[PDB]
Design a protein around this nucleic acid. Structure first.
Ligand SMILES: OC[C@H]1O[C@H](O[C@H]2[C@H](O)[C@@H](O)[C@@H](O)O[C@@H]2CO)[C@H](O)[C@@H](O)[C@@H]1O
Ligand SMILES: OC[C@H]1O[C@H](O[C@H]2[C@H](O)[C@@H](O)[C@@H](O)O[C@@H]2CO)[C@H](O)[C@@H](O)[C@@H]1O
Lengths: 436, 436
DNA sequence: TTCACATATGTGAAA
DNA sequence: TTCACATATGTGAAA
């Protein structure tokens, strides 16, 4: 839980939490507050569950796409940065982190996936997805593979799914339209079918996850991987001479990644809103602080306009942004979570053979906008059925008490119902078939 | 799924999977068989789910406590090492992987928790738990804590619960009595009370999981932790000058850690049982084999006598075996996962204040002893209720078709039953109160 | 041991 | 939307 005068932080385990830890301790020196950094599991999941009850973090670092469902659930404090401060960060970043006309988080870094490749094994990386099967057959003879990446999270497969026209929610007339979902269209189909054919043809494994893919690339057993700027640090410490480049094209179209802005909203229930706002506006959204995080695991193209000038020279970032320009910023709306779960289920079920590609994406397209019943709605149902059983139980209690039927010492209500039926001149068969 | 010609291994994420991989690489070099080592989360829970359908890895590594349940489920191959090979391993480690008279895994190494303390920060570590609150007062004056260890897995707290008399399943007449559980006795209550009192009086934090406790000791913010030999590697790379010593006493009694034998089981569905047996007997369970794993993360006291006589020279292993002597080998019976689930919920509930100690342990006693109904018993129940509903449905089907009851276009069975009641000479109020 | 009503929620109906 | 039987399993009674 939260306690005043302390600072506990939540950020995903693939980010530079230790680098932030370094920043939190210097916040100690200036203002005296102890700041701890914890990298929990499924934090994007645990937060909307625990924050209701007061338990949770002062701050949560996460991509912006989930904050719209959060903010609409009243979990985040509205953000009040000076007009001078907004100018310090790129306007498209503030746009990503704004829901309904209120700024719910601080933009920190812009993230896009890129193709990462081993130059020693592959000095010239492929420009197309279509050439990856042939290239894998070549490298298999040398004891390598062409490409491994996280097939458990749809974030990593969406670029291929979008290339030929697959889309989540079509933005039309100034808004995202949840009636027009494109996870079921011909571009989406072709994208997934190709990914599955790669698996069918033993060029990838359906079980490959984030950890397996990183270890294979970092040890040099795979020539390529798809990942974001956070992964660069571990490749750095490895022995692999790598490059960061544009994603392969599919059917001649670019790979279209979903661009996430790593944001930071504050726990509406925190006793330290401004004692944490010191951190966020005057400590992290600063050049010298972002360096500390970026030094641990790279942040990507940070939203601070002054530090991005230095980082933008890095050819790896230029590539990251080259991919971003070809993709789209994620919507931040509430339906994102249901979209991600539906697409996650569709990829895994098609990758594993559990469902055909058509069946998987068809199921996904209906779930991408499924409404989650409200608490009151669940309580409506719960109470209605409690009433229904209470009425029946009183009927049978009375029948057993005053009926004087010829019943066994112990019997279920069906036997009572049968003895009430015959009394009313019905005959009930053994299996329930009933008639006058 | 397992494939002929390759070996996939599952080992926990805190073990030296990178060292195990190096062993795989030698196997692949002498015999030509590829070996992939993976460390997926919740692997001890994922294996029994996938292996029941013939999926899962070729070899699964875990402490021996979990294998009995795997064997009762027919998920493991029987280990058939020649007598010559069995003799190379300590008899008691073979006992740990014996189930219904058969060997169900290869023992690898003996694991026991120890007290890990920062020599510089805390010379002469405490000999009792009772002096721990006092030692935290002084240490908090220097801005440090006394003790942080994983509070989310009961493994780490069990030594204190068992100290004054808590036990899991009582051994009697040559077998563990699954009905005689000792998680509720006075000794267990005294141990969990002392632990909760540490949190109440602010000497410990209830949310502390493995990574928080590890980062704290390694960074130098706590004078002690409780952990196994796998964690020394990470401590070594840190600045900290650490010692490994006997766990403190509780109420003048030694702490009694549950002793684990890290074990390798062979999936019953693997078409590579001979290859797996060759890899385990002639590559892993060799001096060179265990050394490469051990160098990655220390294994503890290995079961192979030849390499153990070298590892025993290490004072950290002597301590670890000093704690082991005070504890007990874990049972391997299938009921062990139900005992761990119960105690896990108990410690977390008491640590958090969601339950009293007495209430949390009472519920854990009942859960740990709970007789798990068999599939057939589950099926009997399912079928019985299915039959009961079906008979009811027919009775109401017939009543609606032939009743002419003056019922609305659509109405629930309760209303049909009401109509029947009045036809038979009853009155039924709205609320179900029924009398003749 | 078997058994039966209780349980919140699921599937899908009727608007 | 609200509604209602179905769902496997829970709780606990009666041997
Ligand atoms: O896979 C669905 C998932 O995608 C994104 O998660 C990213 C995250 O944005 C990155 O910062 C990094 O942690 O990798 C994640 C994928 O493993 C979305 O942000 C997230 O909401 C969505 O569920
Ligand atoms: O916490 C319950 C847990 O205890 C043991 O797990 C140990 C494991 O033996 C060690 O090798 C190490 O990895 O730490 C684990 C605890 O997090 C039991 O072996 C396990 O079955 C049980 O659930």
């Amino acid at each position: 839980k939260i306690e005043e005068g302390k600072l506990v932080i939540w950020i995903n385990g693939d980010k530079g939490y230790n680098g932030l830890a370094e920043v939190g301790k210097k916040f100690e020196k200036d203002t005296g507050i102890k700041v701890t950094v914890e990298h929990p599991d499924k934090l994007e999941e645990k937060f909307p569950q625990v924050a209701a009850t007061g338990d949770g973090p002062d701050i949560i670092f996460w991509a912006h796409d989930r904050f719209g469902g959060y903010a609409q659930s009243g979990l985040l404090a509205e953000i009040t940065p000076a007009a001078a401060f907004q100018d310090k960060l790129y306007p498209f970043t503030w746009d990503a982190v704004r829901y309904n006309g209120k700024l719910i988080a601080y933009p920190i870094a812009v993230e896009a996936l890129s193709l990462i490749y081993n130059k020693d094994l592959l000095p010239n990386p492929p420009k197309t997805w279509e050439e990856i099967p042939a290239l894998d057959k070549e490298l298999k003879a040398k004891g390598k593979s062409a490409l491994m990446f996280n097939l458990q999270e749809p974030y990593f497969t969406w670029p291929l799914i979008a290339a030929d026209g697959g889309y989540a929610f079509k933005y039309a007339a100034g808004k995202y339209d949840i009636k027009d979902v494109g996870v079921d269209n011909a571009g989406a189909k072709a994208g997934l079918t190709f990914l599955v054919d790669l698996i069918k043809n033993k060029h990838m494994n359906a079980d490959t996850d984030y950890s397996i893919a990183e270890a294979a690339f970092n040890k040099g057993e795979t020539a390529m991987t798809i990942n974001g700027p956070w992964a660069w640090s571990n490749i750095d410490t490895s022995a692999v001479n790598y490059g960061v480049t544009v994603l392969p094209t599919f059917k001649g179209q670019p790979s279209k990644p979903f661009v996430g802005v790593l944001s930071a909203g504050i726990n509406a229930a925190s006793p330290n809103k401004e004692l944490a706002k010191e951190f966020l506006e005057n400590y992290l959204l600063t050049d010298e602080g972002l360096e500390a995080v970026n030094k641990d695991k790279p942040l990507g193209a940070v939203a601070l306009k002054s530090y991005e000038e230095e980082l933008a020279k890095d050819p790896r970032i230029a590539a990251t942004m080259e991919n971003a320009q070809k993709g789209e910023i994620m919507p931040n709306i509430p339906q994102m979570s249901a979209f991600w779960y539906a697409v996650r289920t569709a990829v895994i079920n098609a990758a594993s053979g559990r469902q055909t590609v058509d069946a998987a994406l068809a199921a996904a397209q209906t779930n991408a906008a499924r409404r989650k019943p409200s608490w009151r709605e669940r309580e409506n149902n719960r109470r209605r059925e409690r009433r229904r059983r209470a009425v029946a139980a009183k009927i049978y209690t009375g029948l057993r008490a005053q009926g004087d039927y010829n019943l066994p010492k112990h019997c279920d209500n069906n036997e009572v119902l049968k003895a009430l039926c015959v009394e009313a001149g019905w005959v009930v068969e053994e299996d329930g078939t009933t008639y006058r």
